[PDB]
Amino acid sequence: VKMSPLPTVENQFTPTTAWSTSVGSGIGNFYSNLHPALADNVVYAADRAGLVKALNADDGKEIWSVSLAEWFSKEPALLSGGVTVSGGHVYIGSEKAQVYALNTSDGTVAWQTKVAGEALSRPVVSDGLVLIHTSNGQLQALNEADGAVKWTVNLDMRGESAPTTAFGAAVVGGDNGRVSAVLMEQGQMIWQQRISQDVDTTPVVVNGVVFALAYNGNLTALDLRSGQIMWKRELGSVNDFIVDGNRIYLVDQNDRVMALTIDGGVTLWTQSDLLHRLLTSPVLYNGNLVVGDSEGYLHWINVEDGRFVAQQKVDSSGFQTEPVAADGKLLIQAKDGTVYSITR
Numbered sequence: 001v002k003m004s005p006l007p008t009v010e011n012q013f014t015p016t017t018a019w020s021t022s023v024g025s026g027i028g029n030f031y032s033n034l035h036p037a038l039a040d041n042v043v044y045a046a047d048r049a050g051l052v053k054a055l056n057a058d059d060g061k062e063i064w065s066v067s068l069a070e071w072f073s074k075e076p077a078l079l080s081g082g083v084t085v086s087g088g089h090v091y092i093g094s095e096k097a098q099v100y101a102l103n104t105s106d107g108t109v110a111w112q113t114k115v116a117g118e119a120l121s122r123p124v125v126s127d128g129l130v131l132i133h134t135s136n137g138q139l140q141a142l143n144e145a146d147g148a149v150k151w152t153v154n155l156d157m158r159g160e161s162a163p164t165t166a167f168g169a170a171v172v173g174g175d176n177g178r179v180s181a182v183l184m185e186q187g188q189m190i191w192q193q194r195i196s197q198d199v200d201t202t203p204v205v206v207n208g209v210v211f212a213l214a215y216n217g218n219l220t221a222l223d224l225r226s227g228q229i230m231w232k233r234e235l236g237s238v239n240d241f242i243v244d245g246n247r248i249y250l251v252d253q254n255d256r257v258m259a260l261t262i263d264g265g266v267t268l269w270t271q272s273d274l275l276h277r278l279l280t281s282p283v284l285y286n287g288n289l290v291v292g293d294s295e296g297y298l299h300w301i302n303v304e305d306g307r308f309v310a311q312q313k314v315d316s317s318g319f320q321t322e323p324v325a326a327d328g329k330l331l332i333q334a335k336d337g338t339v340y341s342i343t344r
Contacts, residue, residue, distance in 0.1 A: 019060035024051035026337025050077030093119025111147035292319030
């Protein structure tokens with residue numbers, strides 16, 4: 001295996017960097033799911049060692065910052081899952097099995113809770129609860145007001161695995177190959193389905209259908225209500241996907257990018273010119289598919305035919321965690337921690 005060359009692309013437009021701002025030492029060479037959040041024109045971002053910053057979304061200037069690092073005088077917090085913002089709190093999970101809630105106003109700690117295992121996936125907030133899927137197979141619901149554990153479900157037992165929420169239920173994937181639905185009220189189990197016999201096992205729930213990758217990279221669609229399997233695509237080896245309209249866009253383990261029909265394809269097209277370049281998850285921005293690579297380039301892809309429409313060099317430390325498209329903005333954090341706002 002060898003990395004594909006940088007594609008030659010005739011830019012249809014010239015994307016640029018609007019601003020960039022350092023955030024500590026980022027994630028370095030460690031695997032992480034840590035990425036930025038955006039709410040009310042403020043970007044919230046963190047680094048593994050424990051630094052968290054709030055930045056003005058128009059110019060990237062710091063509003064507040066806080067270090068969460070606490071036999072030695074100081075030790076890294078190992079921030080990992082997040083950042084998630086909701087209702088005046090910033091939520092971040094750590095590999096030390098802590099979940100932090102910070103005030104959006106000033107970065108002060110609202111609460112901190114010891115959870116049942118490493119919190120490597122983004123906190124997901126719904127109905128007054130912060131849902132935490134721990135790396136050792138538990139789903140825990142914390143009160144957003146005080147961080148107390150309201151309920152805990154054993155699922156139960158490398159790639160992100162956040163819960164998904166839908167109409168009063170949480171849906172969780174992850175090892176070992178089962179998808180589960182539980183009721184938010186008290187964590188009552190509704191159903192489980194086996195979809196098995198790196199990978200983002202976070203389910204995506206769209207219009208009553210659960211789309212989920214198995215740890216082996218097979219893509220499956222399940223009925224939200226019953227967990228019945230509607231279709232499975234033994235590609236396999238998908239790493240990340242998104243759903244939009246009647247299409248699924250995905251990046252496979254070899255960094256091929258494809259578009260599938262929402263009925264499980266039909267592969268509409270495959271773009272293989274980024275093979276082995278080590279891509280981020282894809283996002284949609286201004287109608288184009290965007291992915292970053294390990295060399296620090298962003299690649300802009302036409303969703304109709306998979307052709308490149310633009311390419312830009314952003315950060316020599318490279319990309320790994322997900323680009324974020326929200327509120328008309330495109331944000332991405334480099335491995336060395338630098339957060340970028342990108343303009344089309």
